[PDB]
Amino acid sequence: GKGKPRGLNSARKLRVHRRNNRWAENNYKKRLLGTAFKSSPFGGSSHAKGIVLEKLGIESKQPNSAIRKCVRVQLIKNGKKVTAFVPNDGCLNFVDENDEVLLAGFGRKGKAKGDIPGVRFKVVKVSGVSLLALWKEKKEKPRS
Amino acid sequence: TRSSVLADALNAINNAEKTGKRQVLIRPSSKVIIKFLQVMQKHGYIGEFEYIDDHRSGKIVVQLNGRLNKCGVISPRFNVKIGDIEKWTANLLPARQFGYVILTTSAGIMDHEEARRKHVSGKILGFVY
Amino acid sequence: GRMHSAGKGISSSAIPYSRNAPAWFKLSSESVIEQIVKYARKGLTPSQIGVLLRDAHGVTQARVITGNKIMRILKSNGLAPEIPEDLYYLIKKAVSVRKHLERNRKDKDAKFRLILIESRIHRLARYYRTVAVLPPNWKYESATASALVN
RNA sequence: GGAUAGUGGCCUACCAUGGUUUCAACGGGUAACGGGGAAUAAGGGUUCGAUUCCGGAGAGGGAGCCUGAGAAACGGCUACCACAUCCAAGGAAGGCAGCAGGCGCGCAAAUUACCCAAUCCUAAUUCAGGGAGGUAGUGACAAUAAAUAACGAUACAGGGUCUUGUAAUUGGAAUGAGUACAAUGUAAAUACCUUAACGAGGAACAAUUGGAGGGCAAGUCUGGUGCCAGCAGCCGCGGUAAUUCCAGCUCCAAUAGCGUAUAUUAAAGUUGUUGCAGUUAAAAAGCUCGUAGUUGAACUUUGGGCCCGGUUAACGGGGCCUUUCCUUCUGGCUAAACCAGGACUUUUACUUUGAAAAAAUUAGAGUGUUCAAAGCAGGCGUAUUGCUCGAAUAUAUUAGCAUGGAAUAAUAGAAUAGGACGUUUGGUUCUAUUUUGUUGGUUUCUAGGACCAUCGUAAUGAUUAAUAGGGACGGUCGGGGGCAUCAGUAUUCAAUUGUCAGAGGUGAAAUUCUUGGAUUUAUUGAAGACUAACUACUGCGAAAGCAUUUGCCAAGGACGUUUUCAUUAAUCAAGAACGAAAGUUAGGGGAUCGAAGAUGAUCAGAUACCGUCGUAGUCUUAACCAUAAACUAUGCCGACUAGGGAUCGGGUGGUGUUUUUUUAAUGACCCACUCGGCACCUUACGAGAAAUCAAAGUCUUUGGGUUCUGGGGGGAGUAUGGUCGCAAGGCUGAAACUUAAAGGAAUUG
RNA sequence: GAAUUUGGACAAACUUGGUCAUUUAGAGGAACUAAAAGUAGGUUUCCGUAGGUGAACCUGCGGAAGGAUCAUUA
């Protein structure tokens, strides 16, 4: 029984059934349609670079708040505008407008880790130097 | 329709043992069914069976003596290359010291240890333990 | 079960466990043979010959008494019809239900039953022309089948 | 025929009309050079392979060509295209996907260094050349080995006279990170190995990277900061969607490494062949027929005896006999029959063994690279003219070749004998390796074939009739279908008649009909629809569905059968038949009910959102449409597994009951049995998340055959394409994006 | 034996016409969002289809329970 063919010469039906079924997945469907190249915010890559268009102030709540807001950045290759997540307070004043930041993912395969809806990227480098080391007064930002 | 008589025989024997009967009647009969029962009888898993003979196909009455865990058929009958035989054991026997898989080789129907001892192999037929 | 129905009946005849010439018969072996060819020359099918022989003359079945079946007896003496018996009766039934369907157009039940009968005819005709009894094509058609049955 | 180095539609003339494909041809995509291989390791798989080895192709894009054995060559030429260089403005020259190096592109990648010393290649050739190649520079791609400390003495805490730790207590030893004579190394140097001299007392020569609610190891720490119509009153306490707001102390893990991002793999049985699921959680086509595909009952030499002989009485080997080695031919024993010998599947599938299968990589044997990753080295001596081991082995799962087997699954053979076998006789048709001197032709003999006829020789040739299937027949059975016919009240309308003031409608009114008599009563007539009660945990049909009488027409299941044929079967993309209600195009007829529409009153409450009139429709004919909670929310075929009582159809039996008017057929009933149905009750041998299930059982101990469908929730049955339909619409049918849940089943507040 | 020339095959490329496909301007509109802050009642739940309504919703025909069986006799 079991609903599938079982004859010794019945391999072609199994193969074409598996092809169609594998097409009904999500990983295989995005891998063999090349979705990461046409419609992805990146070019199917890990990091990216882009100039900071503007800084948008999405706070936690009404005035008694925790400051977790970041910038809207347009890319270099796609030209597409996304929003990032700068790390903790004291790092926000480093990133200015038109600041050539290098960006990475956030850690959930295209989904928002954390309780901030609508951000999938975080700033890794600002002005092409660093962000973690520049915050820890270990280096200084080069001018332009 | 009746695709495999060996499946019917083995399912009947398994159901009879799990219910707890003493003897079971199997219809139809075959050379493959007779040889399977002869191997199971040689290794002590069943008791004594008789071939009732009408003209058409025959019937078999098998008298069980317990000590039968599970017997089963493998449809389709895959070609088992000799280096693969223990692989089949490693799929469908509970342990390594007891349990048998039955190969239809060109030297007849025989258990897998005799197949390894005779350096012969063939198609798969079923298993018993 | 059935082939074109949901039924699951098992009513049939049961050949006994004796292939040897019942003792109370003790009449002949050839006399029934020219009696069979006389019955066939009268114009009956082998099944009707068999039922008349077991109803009237005590022949249990013609295979055990003579050693040959009835259709081989008729084929040996050149009484065999050009098409076999069951296909002939299926074509006859299809012709009759087709005439009924012609006279009553809105009988959709007869349409379905005719489709079933014709599919049965096609399966049987494919078997007969496969085993090389019928001519190699034989081309079953709606019209000429009427001219085939009479 | 031409052309080619050569075959070939490679080209040309002539003639045919073929060739491929549902076993997916042809077309479209590829973020596609192919392979040896790489990661992942229970197995099977999944994912990558531009890249060091092999083969292909290109030198900015096309095309053409000389030289030459070899090029459609670009560190060769010619023309066009796109770029672009130089200047005296006439003209000339160009091709880094060779090595360095630059711009651009980017998340992403090094020196315009030295040399032929090694490996090999080229040349007239030991000698010349080689950005091939090697050496060094940059280099945390990856991989190997392991520095940042070790031992005492004193005082305490201990276990307690021998053992641990603590200390702004103390003693000297050891050594390389480095600096560097020298020598080695090297084409020359750098570096490594060796080494005279210098080089350790903590802010030395100082180790980092993440984290401490759970997952997941380690805080019942400290302080400060921003908010309070909470207490107190200027000290403060407590609360703070302060998603902790931040620092310090302490602790955990790994360590010269650690973290993050994207992709991929394992855990995942979220691809399921092994190995998923489909009653209710995603998911069984509305139903049936049916082509390809997949799958398909049993049966034909088994058994016995004989020896010999391999391994530690058991396992496994081969030959003889038992009606039993059949087959294509030479050399000998002989009187068609033996031996020595050349070999054979009607066709396969399958399986064992073998050959031929690049190296590197993988598994793996040997060997102290000081160990190890590596490498194929090395080992031993009178170390004075020496000796010698090795560089194994395995894997390669398809295809092709050779070979032993004959279980399993297929194919064919004698049915109109046109079948086999021969020292059975005749005729035809052909051939000669020869002898008559060699040869051409003529004839006979001889020998070998093939063909047409007659004698025989023989156990002369046909497997069961599957609790598979179709067919025939007998008696039934059914609210199964079509046409025609018959009937029953009821509803509405009309005629006649009786009598008077209201009748309908609502929770309450109003519209409506009414002294030309409303509603009600009586008699009669007409039209269309529908078939109550009987009507059931009953029947029929593939489902949708089917309920008055009678007749005709064809069909159907089950039972009975010592009838017939002998596999004709199960399931099923393509294709097709039917398909509730609603709906569409014309004709008919219109009694009820009634979308739309029209009017009445809208009274807090409609809990009691209505009333009356009424179009399409409801009925039917001829065409369309193909959808339903089309539900048993359970595909179809087969096998087995548990008790009981009803009930429908058929059959068997009863010196059983009843009505015959004589107890003969037959009917109704009762008891027992059987086959095929619709169902019901209890239980768990079992199953399940549970509700529950005799199937939803026979399943981690997972395989009887087959078809369809599903892969977290939305976007979405939406967009686009095609196709069917007059239309309504149907069938097929995404993605971007968004989210950590949506959901199923019971018990409890 | 050069310049030059006739015919042919190999053919780069240019002008026009059609066709395929990618990207970017362009009125209009409908969707979604945070928008801290705008304008008491009916209650069976659905399915197919037809008509009507800002608005779920209502009505007509057919279907399903994914809706809670008491008493009596046999």
Numbering used by the authors:
A (entry chain SX): 2 to 145
B (entry chain SW): 2 to 130
C (entry chain SN): 2 to 151
Provide passages from the article that reported this PDB entry.
The most notable feature of Tsr1-1, the earliest state, is the highly flexible 40S head. Unlike the highly dynamic 40S head, the 5' and central domains of the 18S rRNA are almost mature, as in the primordial pre-40S. This allows the helices h27 and h44 of the 18S rRNA to mature, and the CPK to fully assemble. After the release of Bms1 and association of Bud23, the Tsr1-1 state in yeast, which directly precedes Tsr1 recruitment, displays the rRNA h18 in a new immature conformation and a highly flexible 40S head. However, the time point at which this occurs is not clearly defined; indeed, states Tsr1-1 and Tsr1-2 were both observed with and without uS5 incorporated. Although, we were missing the states that could show the remodeling of the primordial pre-40S (now described by Cheng et al.NAR), the Tsr1 states are likely to represent the earliest nucleoplasmic intermediates, in which the 40S head is prepared for further remodeling.
Here, we elucidate the enigmatic structural transitions of assembly intermediates from human and yeast cells during the nucleoplasmic maturation phase. After dissociation of all 90S factors, the 40S body adopts a close-to-mature conformation, whereas the 3' major domain, later forming the 40S head, remains entirely immature. By combining yeast and human structures, we uncovered 16 different pre-40S assembly intermediates, most of which represent the long-sought nucleoplasmic pre-40S ribosome.
